[PDB]
């Protein structure tokens with residue numbers, strides 16, 4: 553019921569995302585559902601795709617209502633297609649409630665499900681504006697807040713076989729150390745934020761800060777990498793290269809086109825910290841989040857032809873995406889009631905004896921509004 557009963561309600565595997573158990577229909581059908589703050593549709597497998605463990609069978613549900621409307625969602629790395637309806641939805645290890653939510657019954661997809669994963673649909677937690685087919689399709693969390701007395705916020709602790717917590721309706725103070733710092737949500741569509749400054753190992757990148765948000769910056773648990781606009785990526789790598797001079801590496805590595813390996817002997821110490829300064833709550837005030845190489849150098853456990861690592865910072869043409877690389881350092885509070893997102897040092901982030909992930913402030917930063925793109 554309460555927040556204790558929600559601790560540790562997330563599961564997954566490295567590179568396959570975090571999922572929460574949900575029930576849909578009556579009687580309740582159990583599905584595992586990818587937690588995605590980067591989209592706004594609740595969409596589940598509804599047909600026996602050979603790689604799904606379980607799927608939504610509408611014919612078995614007494615409370616199912618056909619909306620007599622289809623939906624077609626292409627995106628860069630894939631597509632799904634489905635039939636809109638509504639049904640009763642519960643979260644067993646969430647608040648003690650049942651709600652009537654929109655469901656897209658997925659009937660055809662390409663490169664949407666992961667071969668080998670233990671989830672079979674997606675929970676988009678972002679805002680109606682980016683819901684398919686349009687913002688009249690009320691996102692799940694909107695329905696949850698409207699139909700109940702669950703407070704309008706949730707928080708995510710992503711750890712990594714991975715685990716974590718999704719606290720629906722509140723904050724659990726044991727999941728973080730130090731204090732929460734809040735950045736405003738710039739516009740309620742994605743969880744858009746504004747980055748005001750970037751440092752590699754204390755050294756500023758000294759770019760026009762608008763480049764950091766071209767054409768936007770988002771917090772997205774449905775993306776693995778920290779993704780950076782192309783110009784920003786170029787400068788960051790050039791600067792990460794300079795700082796990690798001790799060893800040299802091929803161009804293909806930085807591009808995520810090869811891995812690089814060490815004996816059972818990783819010198820994380822040879823790699824720099826990365827700091828993002830975010831717009832703060834108050835005029836001219838910012839704060840910074842700092843991640844370790846333990847967040848951006850990801851063990852590739854599946855290398856059959858060989859301890860290898862993927863460089864998990866990549867180029868974007870869609871703006872900055874603070875994906876799992878960022879969120880695994882932090883307890884992240886999606887404070888929808890106050891249009892703000894909070895960051896605190898996660899009690900489960902992977903670090904060593906030399907260095908920690910950090911959230912520090914306040915700092916004084918001028919023209920922070922100028923960093924947003926229009």
Ligand SMILES: NC1=N[C@@]2(c3cc(NC(=O)c4ccc(Br)cn4)ccc3F)OCC[C@H]2CS1
Pocket residue numbers: 566567568569570586588589590591627630664674772773774775776876
């Ligand atoms: N936010 C995102 N949403 C998606 C989307 C995301 C995912 N995510 C993952 O598989 C995933 C997450 C975390 C880790 Br760690 C590893 N993998 C799977 C299918 C999707 F369709 O939906 C609409 C846009 C699309 C791309 S961007």
